[model samples]
Target chain A: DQQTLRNLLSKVSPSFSAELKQLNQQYEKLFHKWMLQLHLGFNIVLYGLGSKRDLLERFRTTMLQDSIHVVINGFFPGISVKSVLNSITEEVLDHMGTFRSILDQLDWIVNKFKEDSSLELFLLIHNLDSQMLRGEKSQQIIGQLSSLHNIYLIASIDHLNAPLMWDHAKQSLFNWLWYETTTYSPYTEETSYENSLLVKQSGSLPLSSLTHVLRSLTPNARGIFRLLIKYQLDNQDNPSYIGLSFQDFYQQCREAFLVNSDLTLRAQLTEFRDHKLIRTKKGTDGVEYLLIPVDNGTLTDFLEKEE
Target chain B: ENVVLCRESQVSILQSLFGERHHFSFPSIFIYGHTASGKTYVTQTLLKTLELPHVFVNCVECFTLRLLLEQILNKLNHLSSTEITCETFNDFVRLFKQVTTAENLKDQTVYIVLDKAEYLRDMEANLLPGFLRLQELADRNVTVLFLSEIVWEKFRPNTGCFEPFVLYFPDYSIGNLQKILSHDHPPEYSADFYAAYINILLGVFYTVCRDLKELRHLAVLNFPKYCEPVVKGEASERDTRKLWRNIEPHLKKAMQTVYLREISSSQWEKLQKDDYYSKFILIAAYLASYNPARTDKRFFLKNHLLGPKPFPLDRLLAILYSIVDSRVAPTANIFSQITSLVTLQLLTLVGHDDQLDGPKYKCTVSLDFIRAIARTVNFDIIKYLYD
Candidate 1:
């Protein structure tokens, strides 16, 4: 039935998404295999492609005998760790706190749930490594929540660095049992980025958020953002062209009269840094590089609108 | 109008609270607020104003809604002919039918008010619906009014039938609250006196106390004490600044009463007790997590965002060294911290790619979590943070 539905509507077309179907079976079969590693007490995280949501929902409904469960869709925009903690705290534990610090409240949620053996909470989180859940501190909050003995967390990560959210020395403290659910089924949830609540849930602005950002910045900031956008757009067609080296890019900015010095350029960079509009990295040879996260037309629409 | 403290405009909307319906219709009103938001006081005021026949029951005091059903039946008087004995929820259903039916209640409106309705927010699945069900019968006019300090939304009623037409009683904002507070704190002696007083305690009240009752209680108890410096002549008239200095000490004693949710010096001690090196790694780990986003993926689960903004061994090492004093901790000391940091699961490194070329790492923690971690080490990690 899903396949038939996918034939009519799936963007992931059968060739690309379906190839992983057999691999998922092998991955699911290893559930028992990973459970042994999980027996050591740390929770499990599955890193893979596709909607881990569809897979985890089955576990919540069918797998457990007498455990309490809460499913969190980590990718749901604006879903903060506190909101999740507040739900589990107020609902599962029936405990309320002033909830001063994020860390304290998270620890309380996990530890308090850990104390009671009356029930084991199977916190099945889909996409635990969301940008919203980014930062070592944020993952540790999730890690602590999953760390409890009775609180078994089965979260899935679709990012390359999901494991890096936790430092290696203590990733085991939460006892992270990683499984690769690589390969998959057809999914429409993949390509459909904007939904009914996008404008409100995400910070909305003029043109693109980038252009809106430029409108308020020094003309220098505008020039730099425009430069980066042009750079990203210029090379996007040719992935073969590696990034412009950092020093090389800065020298170009200087030549263009966009910046007098590196310090002014860096201040402009920091503003975009927070919104994740662009990035600068040092190279192996100690030169530098810069790049933007936005795509070609998405930004051109914004840049041209204001221009 | 119900609730003495409720703004007159807000109290003016009490008709909905009554669910003022015909024998043909009754709507449920859900009054939600925190303590001193006047939810309980407001309902009673409306019951009297509307001159509607009423039954108020405190669910918490009643202990069990089973007992509440019996107590409600006893207080209601026209019913309870059927013994309110060892009966289940079906008993309340039958009683609600009897009470709301046309034969028992004719040409009259009776409000069923649940004070501390917060308790009912967590009460059995049946009780809420059972009470709400009373409104369904067209034979009699009944409205269920919940007087609760319960932020009822906190209770996820996703799959329940007990939906109420919500009336949110919000906490008073500082400016509006100052208007109400002026009645208690006077400007009798001088303008400077009350200005300084309001300015000093108002911030504390605005930040700390959401409960009007608790706020008023603190205000009345502390205002006279703040006058002590002026009373003693240690400060001259119009000396608001010096008066503040003298009284703020004594005033904070009253402040101790209002329990603010804040982490003190000792609260950060838990992280301190843990390995300090782990804290450093945790900071590094955050940088790696938010390391930066330079890629966007179209399909095939090729998530560019998940690149982990990971730093190879050299970059991660360079970042760690830049933030910390190199002379204070040797390279070996830093590595030990890195080892434990990796152990704590706060940081991670890709092994196969880096084991030979040098390990690359990403911080796996939230930026907020690392800021707290950063605070302990007296370090700024803005440089390393990526995504």
Candidate 2:
């Protein structure tokens, strides 16, 4: 799985290769190898499916549990997966995909997610559309995601390629759920039955049991949870019901997000409007909009609520 | 309208004008007199009454032939459409005759008034022959009215050169002086009185008048008064007697020395040693006493006493050597002082004191006295020393 993932990531997307030659070259020779090493360690520990899985899990648990003490004790616990990811993203990817390349990579990730699961992808896309329509796409998370996705799609492919790599894994996971039904169930019937049994046997353990389970999966499930949370939040607002001019919506988005690139922001706003997350009313003054929600209900509540 | 008063020095000019055979056929009127003797005024008056097509060239201002011609042409252009050139200045008489003849403006003469005529150097003077030739060519249709303070003797006429139609202007009489002093615009009298007071103190009129102008700067009542009202008026008699009395003390000693010849060449040498007299005051006093009426007598005396008589080369050098060694003080102030005294005296003698008050004093020095002194001195010596 590690080799496959590396190979897939290493394969230079032909669409971006010409414009992203510098980034591609950097990754191929240096950053890609570093990422491979990181991914290799992570794969060996998490998905190696070898006899070391229990040991690696126990090591991860020990590190997390002892991290605070280790830090207080001033003992360096070597490098972790998160630390390695942070180093690669900050030191390497940040420099490589300064502006346009990051947006391009984001677009590719969004497209890939849509290819993987249209239902989840449509939920996010529809929610983004509604947020944009209501002109609520400023500092809000869904608005940020919608703008990030649009900018990712239309950004100059060359400039943003390396940062795309930094975000590739999480975005890829999102695309998978968005394009196809996921077999990896976040909730198991056994776990749910146990939780129900616990609730019947001792109602006092219900919250703790649910929290423990969620906390235990957080390291692997945090990206999906965050995405769903953003989607739900965007939908709950009935963003589409709010009417705002396109210019006002864009201005709101600009004010909300700390976007430095004028080209990126303009492209993102244009893309969101095109995707109908917002509807426009044309007049001499300008084109106004109405936002619409794509997803319904709280994703967190939905996951935790009884059938 | 009336016959112009002529100077004794300008008798030759009168002779050249109305004399037998009339030196030249052209009406070459020579207006000769000492400076400030009303020559220009008289010339202007004549031009006005005659209603002549005339041009006035103040040669003091127009230094070169080109400048003179330009001024003449400008005047001609304004007066009438007559093209004037350098050659035209000479041929003005002929041109005038032709124009007047064609227009039948006969008996209506054209006049060219050259003021400050004394300023013409030898080179400029050479051009006078050409002008006379033009007068001959014009058949007397033009009249050259030349005004100058220079005596006729100053003009060493080139042999065979035709003379111009001439006239002469005399120095101001006591009456003329009175008229000028009592004119509606008389200069400050109190200032002149102070000048006279200083003149009495100095005993040398030139020195006194000089310091007076330096201190008081009033000429109308100072030097001019002696020639005008001071000596004439009965009330001025007392003041004049007092001034004479004050000056007589200094004059008596100077006159005795000149009369008795009591001072030897060696004694004269010792006298020259005295700073006050050595600087040439006594000589000026003696000359002032010698000829009270001689124009520039005080200047001649000052120049003589300062060492080096202007002419008789052998005598001038001997006198110069006897006085002082030239190597002793190369930049001596005495020479300049002598020149100043000479200039002031010459200005007074020529009656230019009336006109030369402040800025005009410098003009009087440069235009009148300096050149005249240069002419009187050995031209070669002056050229060697200054040129």
Candidate 3:
């Protein structure tokens, strides 16, 4: 009985000792994490990108393959129902064979991609776009992409009329289904295709072009456009409907737009009102007119189209 | 004319003789009792019977001695047939003698009933000594009745000279409370309800029942609900639960027994050195001193302190703490601090005032906060080291 009790006590004692050891290890890890967190300030993304490059690259490659599979097979391979069920099959699977073949192909492709620095640039741009769509560090990613010449890749991909063969590669990388072959005419010298190309390539537009576009509109239209642009620049989501009373719109035009106009304010108002670009209604306060977008699309779409 | 033996005549004679005697001698008679122990009605009845040239100066109305004296002088002048001057004090004594010593009067008793005697601002200057002097002048001929909701023991004499009178009115019995609640012209509530109501009222009687007038006002307000005996045994048990629930929310995080115990022994040691527990006691003591009918009613209207309309133990805590912190001790002004709280308010000088010997010419008034601190520290084991 004494021996049995001794053995029981020994078993219980080790379990407690093991728990204490685990707790101590957890405490040490927590302390270290806290110390690191305190030392690093605000820019955690830079730390992740710089220190965990290997892990990030691995995730990027996996996500890229998943996207490619989605485009080609109309579904992601590993995530498909058949693949999920196959993993649970009772049959002895040829895991070594399958892994060897896939590993060899991946090794070659990975090395080739590594050698081609342009692919790394493309991956970075694609990662930026993906992260932007996920609403994670989108502004920072956009800023970084703009600094690099890789933002053109995104524009090129988005505006692609047809799949383009790069170096006669059969894969047709960075391709799209529809493309507008004919270049659209620019509204002014500043808004010409040349300037558009320069802006897209450089990932920024010139201030002169921005001002020229602003000057092209009627005073009231210009005033409304500036307000819309201000809202968009502030990253506010465009509402389904936008309304302004006629008096309010006129006041806003007088204050913001027609302050320097050579034409009489009455004539400018009549011109904008007669053009049917603005609508008015008698409200409790006064007659209010709302500037209707003549572009026949959302401000978001208009901005994107302009870009 | 021959004396008629009709029922009306007999009643008239009895009324005339008693009523005339009451006017001629007893102009007013003061009645006294513990809170919820019928002082107001008794005084009112005495007034009705006498129908004498009298005025009921509720001591509560005169929060200051000056206010009390001014009110008394005003009332005496108003009742007197002749105009009173600066020599009105002499005239007042003469009038008192004249009213009691009227030639045609069969009974020679002049009664002057002063209700809520406890609420007199400065007991030494306004009430105790004033009454003793008045009694000395009246030479026991003019009846001077003093009414109060508080027991005589609760009366802290501003001067040690008034200690003898302070011990005059003893603790009232429950039977006395019953008799007061069951008066014929009782409050608009049932006997059972009044009984339960009085029970709750008496629990914190010292804080609320400063004067008989204030008690009557409270009864008028609470009688409707209490008279129905709505707050009974089971209801009272539920109310007790509600009271604790209301109080638990206001208790500081450290004051909680669970939280205090959860803290390490080292923390408790530090707390002891810093006197952290006093804050909690200060809060509890403030609650102990709150007048539920006045402040608690407002809190109820604002939907702040809810349960019954009157003062509950829980609601009293916050009010008590606020009063002690803001109105008692260091916070109170020099004159008011010395007079109302320091000298007159009994709870303020309960244990400390007795230490002084001889006539205390200028007595130092104890703050309500100090009394609260003493009470709370004494009650809790956590505050055992504080004393």
Candidate 4:
């Protein structure tokens, strides 16, 4: 639903990327903490909203330059644990007669690594909870593989709900040092190179996405989004205009029978704000104005689709 | 084509087995060892060298007695006979005598060697005697060799004078394993492996675990890794220490593989019992975690997910009741099975502080474990998965 707004409104990319980087001020403290834990033999599982990919990439080149780095993009649709196994075996180990046996394959890889104290399979599995990669079977297999001392696995999950996928046994096997990194960086490459899908998938914004965001809200919340879209459409002529003031918006919702009182109107608007359906900015008049981040055409489609 | 290092015992075992073949009335021979302890190597090398007409039938492939007999006869008979009028145990014995009575087989005494032959237990009581006593019972010229692992005693043939001559092939001692492991060429990636390198390995690995197959695998796997700093010539103690450091992980990995694959796969055998009920509980937990589309008390869609969504109790029972049948659960025990899954920690709590709207439960185990679980669940899990 966040994607629905992306198609309609952007003359420029979100300019607050630098500001978001400042939000990650506490990252180095955790990075240093992870560094010690990693050497002490605990693999890491990073989670939180926003992409952790860039941070891990930076850590690999800078912090983890000495060890062998095998990066696997679990987000790629067709990629599986089997391919990951084949790669390490072919490159790192002289594992022959593997015979399509997963047990044999893991057994050899672990033995191969264990036998050689020098070589480390420092695996960076990006997006372990990717839609394609988040099966319990694969997680458990990785669990067994990670249980190996030589193969040090460090995986990141962008989705906040990723921990829901792992059961207790796998969680125990992973024995992971959890890292919370809310980067707030847009997943431009992950969902797609497509900005539309990026916005939709990552909860950034316009068309069908707005409908989706509104669909999850209470009907009163939908009424607020519907009113905001109509307000933005009505004020199309002013190029620099921010939006209708909160007082004006509140009075109209009251007139339209969308809410009973000012407090209820504020609550409805709060839901819309939480969903990023409405962006608030202070105007030259010193009054706070509410603007619909979604554009007109996709908004029309979502409204049409809703009915 | 000779086995070194346990060469004396291996030769004795072979001598005893083939020495019986020389007599006009050949008694059945049983040869068993810990794996890679030269039982198969010694026997096969001797058979291949002498060019005997023997068929090695692995008993694991033969599930039914008909199949075992059929496989044995296929090797003994010159013609590839697929068609069989031989059905019952009587027909089985008759075919054995029937085949040897052929004019071509009269001059030649056949060796029907069953390698890894322990699966003779699959046959109904003392059926091995039927094969063993074939020389007398059917008045045929045949030699039966029952090659097996250490579990050879588990097969109790009929009581009276029925013991086949047993040869024990002991597992390699650390010294024997060390000698055999060092003899393998081109240790992994680079640089030849010699006593200098092996002394280091033997110093570490010789004490705890010594399986020749595992030791040799461990040697080669670690060799390539340790050979990292061997740089043609001119290495010091620091380099050796680095190599040792490199070799250590591969050694641990190899040892653990043997322990896990051999030790834990049997452990999982017990885990696989009542597999269907486990499967239903697993799938139910999976449904609770994955498909979060919920119906209210009135059976209308109250909440849903576009993709994977987590759900709560009413939703889980609703989905469970929609399809639960006598296949995985009887009507009454279905509820109890769900509770059992919770005990297994496969079904677990959903951290109540996060959401107050619903009492959620999730399946927290691997699907691979339950793939076996679903195998016997009367109803087809795969077909339902497609749904």
Model number with the top lDDT: 4
Scoring only the A-chain of each prediction against the true A-chain gives TM-scores of 0.55, 0.19, 0.25, 0.56
Each prediction's whole-model lDDT (CA): 0.61, 0.38, 0.37, 0.63
lDDT of 4 by residue, B1-387 (tens): 454566776677565645544356466777777766776676677677666667777788888877877776677675323545455668777887677665556655567777877766665766776766766776666678877775656777547445677767777666666567566545443333455567677777777756566556555545544554565454543466666666676556655654456545333334323225556557666645654252232222221234334567656655565556434433323443555566576666654322212246666666466566666665454433323
lDDT of 2 by residue, B169-222 (tens): 554544344334332333545555544444453444333222212222233223
- The per-prediction i-RMS, to one decimal, reads 10.4, 52.1, 45.3, 10.7
Specify the poorest-scoring 10-residue window by lDDT in model 3 chain A: A69-78
What is the TM-score ranking, best to worst?
Answer: 4, 1, 2, 3
Candidate 4 error regions (>4 Å):
A1-307, B1-5, B20-22, B79-85, B101-104, B150-153, B157-161, B187-192, B232-246, B249-345, B348-387
How large is the interface RMSD of candidate 4? 10.7
lDDT of 4 at A293: 65
Model 3 chain B worst lDDT run, 10 consecutive residues? B351-360
lDDT of 4 by residue, A82-179 (tens): 77888877776675545567677777666676667676767888778664455455666788888766667788866533454454566567767766
Model 3 lDDT tens row, B1-387? 222111233234334534544353332233344554334553355456556545677877766655655566566556543433333345555655544443433244444567767666344443465564564675534545666666655554556432222212333444454345445444443455445445555443434344444444444443343322234333442354454343233222323432335665455445534643334433433333432344444532342133212223234334444434344432212211222222233224332111111111222223454555666544432222122
Q: State, as a TM-score between 0 and 1, how close model 3 is to the true structure.
A: 0.23
True contacts kept of each: 0.06, 0.00, 0.00, 0.00
lDDT of 1: 0.61
DockQ of 3: 0.00
